[PDB]
Amino acid sequence: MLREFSFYDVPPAHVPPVSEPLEIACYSLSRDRELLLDDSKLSYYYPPPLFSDLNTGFPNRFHPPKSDPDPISIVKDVLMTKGIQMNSSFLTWRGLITKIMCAPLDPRNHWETYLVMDPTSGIIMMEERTNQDRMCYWGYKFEAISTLPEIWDAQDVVPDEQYCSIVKINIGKSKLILAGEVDCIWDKKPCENPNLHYVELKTSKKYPLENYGMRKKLLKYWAQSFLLGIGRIIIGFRDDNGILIEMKELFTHQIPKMLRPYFKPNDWTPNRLLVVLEHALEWIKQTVKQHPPSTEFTLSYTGGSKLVLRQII
């Protein structure tokens, strides 16, 4: 069977309450993508030199990251190994909620996720089952030059090596456990919820906020970081040569405030994106629960203004 959810059919409701995302676990990945149950790979933000060349090391010092998606079983394994209870509606990768949330924003980004309700936990688990160009490298290079590893208590661009935060976040009536890569931390991790100390690093050409493309890009920056409770998004603005010309430190909560003067009528706004997401998540829950556990579904966005949930029979 087929179910549809239309973005524009969502009733005009108040923005759902969203809890402060609470870290329940973290882990690291080695350069060979090996899971490590520690923060050996959490690094610190330190501003890189202005006019750094983001082409340096491409492609000979570049080790492109794994192309295939990771199974969500990993996060479950991690939590099980640590003896952490999982009591939520959803378990997935932050990035897959970003896709649902931002679907109304980029009709060109088509995607497909797999969902199954676990027969023991009753949690809906979501994953993908189906990268190395110069532009991508600019982003990875900016992350590499902007970060300092732990040294006191412990160049090749190897994006496989990373640190990850697993969070509980509630969006209205939906409880989610989300795992996502954290680029670095602003200062020492409170050994206090750590997430507002976390930093996301981005590289972009700078456009005025008048520019629709720029606003949309910022909205997606905001959405991604909002879902993991990240406090800061730091943008390395680059020119067409890939030279770092300016850095801009933003607080995540400031992006919607900063964008307020520039939204044209009928623009998707942070508040509207949250309303639609809550309704999307509620729809997914009710649909999945019309079937026995271990029923596999595909959730698809293939342009237009609808999500499609398909039972795999």
Ligand SMILES: [Mg+2]
């Ligand atoms: Mg980043």
